[PDB]
Symmetry: C2
Subunit: 332 residues, 2 copies
Amino acid sequence: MKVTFEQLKAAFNRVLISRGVDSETADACAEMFARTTESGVYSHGVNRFPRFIQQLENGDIIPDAQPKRITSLGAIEQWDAQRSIGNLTAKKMMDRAIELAADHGIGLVALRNANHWMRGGSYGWQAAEKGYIGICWTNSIAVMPPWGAKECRIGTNPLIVAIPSTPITMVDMSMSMFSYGMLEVNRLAGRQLPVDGGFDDEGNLTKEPGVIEKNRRILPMGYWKGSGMSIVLDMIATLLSDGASVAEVTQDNSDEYGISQIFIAIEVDKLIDGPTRDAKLQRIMDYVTSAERADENQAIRLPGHEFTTLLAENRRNGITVDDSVWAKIQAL
Amino acid sequence: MKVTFEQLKAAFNRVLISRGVDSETADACAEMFARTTESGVYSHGVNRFPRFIQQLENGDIIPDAQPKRITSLGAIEQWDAQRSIGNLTAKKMMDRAIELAADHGIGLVALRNANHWMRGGSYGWQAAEKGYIGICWTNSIAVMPPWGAKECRIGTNPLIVAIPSTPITMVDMSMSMFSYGMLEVNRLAGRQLPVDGGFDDEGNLTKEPGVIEKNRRILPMGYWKGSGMSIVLDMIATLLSDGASVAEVTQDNSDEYGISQIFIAIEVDKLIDGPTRDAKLQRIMDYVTSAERADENQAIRLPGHEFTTLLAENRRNGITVDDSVWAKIQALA
């Protein structure tokens, strides 16, 4: 299904408004969903919209709710999302971390009682666009079994790190090898995973998206490493925000809401000259892309650079949205 | 080879002295090498000592050199290691990041022209011990190929994250599924890797440590994820320290030195109350340990939680060092 940016945003806005969402609020939220999609993020973009509306209709999200600062300690601030829309609030919280960084060199915003932020990379990116280094992560409801377990007691807790390079270089990675959104992406494309993504019915590792989605025995990135990192990320998000951890959300909430997120921005321009910054970054990037290809028919690519190329491709040939997903939205 | 703490430290000290290291710096450095080993870290403890000595002789390291502050911007500071000893200087810089977080809520020291810091978890641990969240990383010489390539163009750039929980929960992970240090540990112990360690020469994945050490085709942890994270960590360390990146080091250096490192300390006690901190953290940890197991006899262990038993056991039973390694060390004299 080929659709234009305008078409996609229209569909998002209509559904939002029909659900009782404020005017400008629906338009703001719809904008982010369409932007994330046009940038090449379908998993946490258009494909996640249906699930988003569901949680909104269930009351998990409070449309008119707004972020409220709780504690101000210089470069550090603790905020209460008040169960407001995840992507709109996150965008605002990362913008605050940036403001703090502009004055303290570094800014950290710890947010509790938040809702799923959709694409964590959105915030890392907005930081990098402003010339800052962007770092953020979130916790979630138990959807991953810690290494050694078969029951979910850990979160996917995506970690984002973005650099103000040209093009912008950025990682946005789930602690699970494949986030659930990417498992769906592969299933919708009718393909199997390129590497192990989980375990089957109490068995060995499998590459079948569907099987993993059902039993939820999703494989942690790097086994014990991803599992471990997820846990420490949850701890930091829980402590600094004095909010709910993966355990608290999974045991005290009906669904995935009231989660904790961390937003960091680090000023660069005062530590290194602009020309030199661009020069050293270029050296690193060329050193990577000029490497010996493992497959001559496959150019080497820097993390996050597809968000620049895919965007150019989309604003030219239009946006391809999975038919089942589009039909799902239209049905709304 | 079962040796006591002082005996192990004594060996490290002897060699350092014979290489021009002054008494005070030799004792402190020897102390760290012994401590890291006693804590259960051999890959970057005693087993890495010989390599350290060689780099010292080649002039990579400048024994009497000390860290120097270049710029002070509140919570953030840029320092120059001046090619000083890596572990000793890294300890001082994380200690600086901590002091900074004490007054600014957060602290970040960007360090350039540094040497290998041995065990990253040492610095994460220092922060956690003082009640702070500790995060730190470093870049290295090209020893790993970026995703999509076969030629080494990126570093293992270990990432450390330590939490002031009881017991301390900490991750110290190489961007490669297995650091070269851990490959050696498995090789000395004589055994295969639990998972894919890398692509065997002109081949596919493999679990043979020795082979991976050859072609250096070490597999990045999480494939494109470990590769990508390695690169962004390299960029941050390079930029904030206005120092050398993996590319610069590999291209303009005879070996692994003049590296860039980042030390972060985050204050906790001002954002959350003591009892609330202990309670929430305990809920997190218990939620993990009580997870239904894949193997009923195999407990679910939290990252870093193994250091308690490793330390307790070494302090009363003694420290067990690899015979070949212990010999290579004495041979240095």
